[PDB]
């Protein structure tokens, strides 16, 4: 199944090593780390346009807070106010925000940090999808003057995760979580969901619109042009390692890892073909290619090693390198080489002259291609239902996502869950109809699925 493929590739391409002396704490190995490093480069290059990165501490006071790991002793000495490994920054980024805000001249403000978080759980240990220590977790907070601009932010926020995701070539379904699932205290939480190969659903990003609710709890006032003092309007949002998890799974494959060009470890890998004849001329030619690519902004690599070229083909291919460039005596003379893709298999033949541009184009192609395929496979698993019994049938038989109309009342909604044993992703305001369950007027389009 998928679950087996997944584990086996993590270990084979050396992404993470699970053999750590504690369940739920995993080690990033060289290759894995590299992919994560490039994934973050993309993310940060977007955020950094109008956001400011910072970095708060790891421990949070028992007091300020009012399944969380607790720090009690400082050796053998019991301390006098317990310290907790950060659940979510809420409790202490805020009190401080109180001190930074004191004039409508200050607002708006947009911060974010990439930190690690903790959650104490049992009976559920799934790699990169559910652990005890979430190594890569980006969270952004924003402060505003008017209740309107808050909502405008929520929109911008969304257009941001779209761009990010589009770059990883990942499909998504944007809805609006039900009030029993929204973020505690928030006005309303919005969610990004994507489909896994095992026909289940993964949450890969949320945007929350708090109110003045927290502003009040922690006292965050700002004096106005009219010389008064009102609380601020704020919003937060974040995404985790799951993003990395999905990029591996979604663009799966039988050969192994297949990755977007700006996420792979190396974009291009140059393999030389030699058999003792003209060896000296082939190499001296492979170099003039690497150094020419490096000094052009290319994450390039040259496999110097002494092994059966056929094997080199295997390794770099299971690992995820997009484009492979082969050089042989024959092609040498003419002044050209062979270029093998990864998403397809097609090996064309281009001239070593304007090769720099041929490669850039091929890269663009590969993404677009991988992206499309991706949406086709998802859209086709979104089926409609009009009778609760029609749902169960489909859920149990074709997994995937299930579309339907819903009244929107709580009870009605929760009973759908208990009968079908599913979770309601969220609404999407659209034309009327009649609820798939209680029959009354249904003013919303909703979704269901089995989730991670």
Q: In whole angstroms, how close is the CB of 438 to Mg ion at the nearest point?
A: 19
Q: What are phi and psi of 111, to 5 degrees?
A: -115, 175
122 belongs to an annotated ligand binding site: no
Please report whether residue 10 would count as binding Zn ion according to CB under 5 A.
Answer: no
Residues in contact with Zn ion, shown as a per-residue x/- string from 265 to 294 under the rule CB under 5 A: ------------------------------
141 belongs to an annotated ligand binding site: no
CB 170 within 8 A of CB 124: no
Residues in contact with a second copy, shown as a per-residue x/- string from 358 to 397 under the rule CB under 8 A: ----------------------------------------
CB 56 within 8 A of CB 89: yes
Could you say which of Zn ion, a second copy, Mg ion, none residue 40 binds, taking C-beta under 5 to 8 angstroms by partner kind? Answer: none
Could you say which of Mg ion, a second copy, Zn ion, none residue 28 binds, taking C-beta under 5 to 8 angstroms by partner kind? Answer: a second copy
CB 65 within 8 A of CB 84: yes
Residue 438's Cβ-side half-sphere holds a number of Cα atoms within 13 Å equal to 15
Residue whose tokens read 């169960």? 392
Please report whether residue 115 would count as binding Zn ion according to CB under 5 A.
Answer: no
Please report whether residue 149 would count as binding Mg ion according to CB under 5 A.
Answer: no
240 belongs to an annotated ligand binding site: yes
What's the full length of the chain, in residues? Answer: 452
Residue 151's Cβ-side half-sphere holds a number of Cα atoms within 13 Å equal to 5
Please report whether residue 28 would count as binding a second copy according to CB under 8 A.
Answer: yes
Strands 233-239 and 444-449: unpaired
Q: In whole angstroms, how close is the CB of 47 to a second copy at the nearest point?
A: 13
CA dist 352 and 354 (Å) reads: 6
Q: Which is nearer to Zn ion, 243 or 427 (CB)?
A: 427
Q: Is 418 helix (H, G, I), strand (E, B) or coil?
A: helix
81 belongs to an annotated ligand binding site: no
236 belongs to an annotated ligand binding site: no
Please report whether residue 92 would count as binding a second copy according to CB under 8 A.
Answer: yes
Helix axis angle for 242-250 and 2-12, nearest 10°, is 110
The residues that touch a second copy, with contacts defined as CB under 8 A, are 17, 19-22, 25-30, 33, 37, 52-59, 61, 64, 67-75, 83, 85, 92, 95-96, 99, 111, 116, 120, 133, 135
């Amino acid at each position: 199944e998928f679950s087996e493929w997944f584990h086996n590739i993590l270990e084979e391409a050396e992404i993470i090593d699970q053999r750590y002396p504690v369940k739920g704490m995993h080690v990033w190995m060289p290759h894995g780390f590299m992919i994560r490093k490039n994934t973050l480069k993309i993310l940060r290059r977007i955020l950094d346009r109008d956001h400011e990165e910072v970095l708060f501490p790891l421990l949070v006071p028992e007091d300020e807070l009012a399944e969380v790991y607790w720090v009690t002793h400082g050796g053998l000495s019991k301390l006098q106010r317990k310290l907790a490994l950060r659940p979510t920054s809420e409790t202490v980024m805020y009190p401080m925000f109180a001190l930074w805000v004191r004039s409508h001249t200050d607002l708006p403000m947009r911060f974010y940090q990439v930190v690690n978080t903790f959650r104490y759980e049992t009976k559920h240990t799934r790699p990169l999808i559910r652990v005890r220590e979430i190594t890569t977790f980006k969270e952004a907070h924003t402060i505003h003057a008017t209740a309107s601009e808050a909502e405008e932010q929520v929109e911008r926020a969304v257009e941001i995760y779209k761009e990010f995701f589009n770059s990883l070539g990942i499909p998504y379904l944007i809805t609006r979580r039900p009030p029993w699932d929204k973020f505690p205290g928030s006005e309303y939480t919005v969610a990004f969901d994507t489909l896994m190969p095992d026909g289940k659903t993964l949450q890969i990003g949320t945007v929350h619109n708090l109110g003045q609710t927290f502003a009040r709890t922690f006292e965050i006032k700002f004096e106005t042009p009219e010389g008064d003092h009102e609380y601020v309007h704020q919003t937060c949002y974040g995404l985790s390692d799951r993003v990395i998890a999905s990029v591996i799974a979604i663009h799966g494959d039988e050969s192994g890892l297949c990755l977007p060009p700006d996420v792979a470890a190396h974009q291009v890998v140059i393999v030389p073909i030699i058999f003792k004849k003209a060896a000296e001329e082939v190499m001296e030619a492979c170099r003039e290619l690497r150094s020419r690519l490096e000094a052009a902004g290319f994450r390039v690599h040259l496999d110097d090693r002494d092994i059966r070229a056929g094997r080199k083909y295997y390794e770099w291919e299971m690992r995820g390198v997009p484009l492979r460039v082969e050089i042989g005596p024959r092609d040498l003379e003419k002044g050209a080489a062979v270029i093998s893709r990864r998403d397809t298999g097609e090996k064309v033949t281009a001239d070593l002259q304007g090769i720099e541009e041929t490669l850039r184009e091929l890269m663009k192609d590969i993404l677009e291609n991988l992206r499309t395929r991706a949406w086709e496979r998802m859209e086709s698993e979104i089926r409609e239902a009009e009778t609760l019994e029609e749902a169960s049938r489909i859920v149990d038989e074709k997994r995937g996502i299930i579309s339907f109309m819903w009244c929107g009342e709580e009870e009605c909604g929760m009973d759908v869950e208990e009968k079908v044993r599913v979770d309601i992703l969220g609404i999407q305001e659209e034309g009327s109809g009649t609820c798939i369950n209680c029959g009354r007027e249904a003013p919303y389009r909703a979704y269901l699925a089995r989730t991670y």
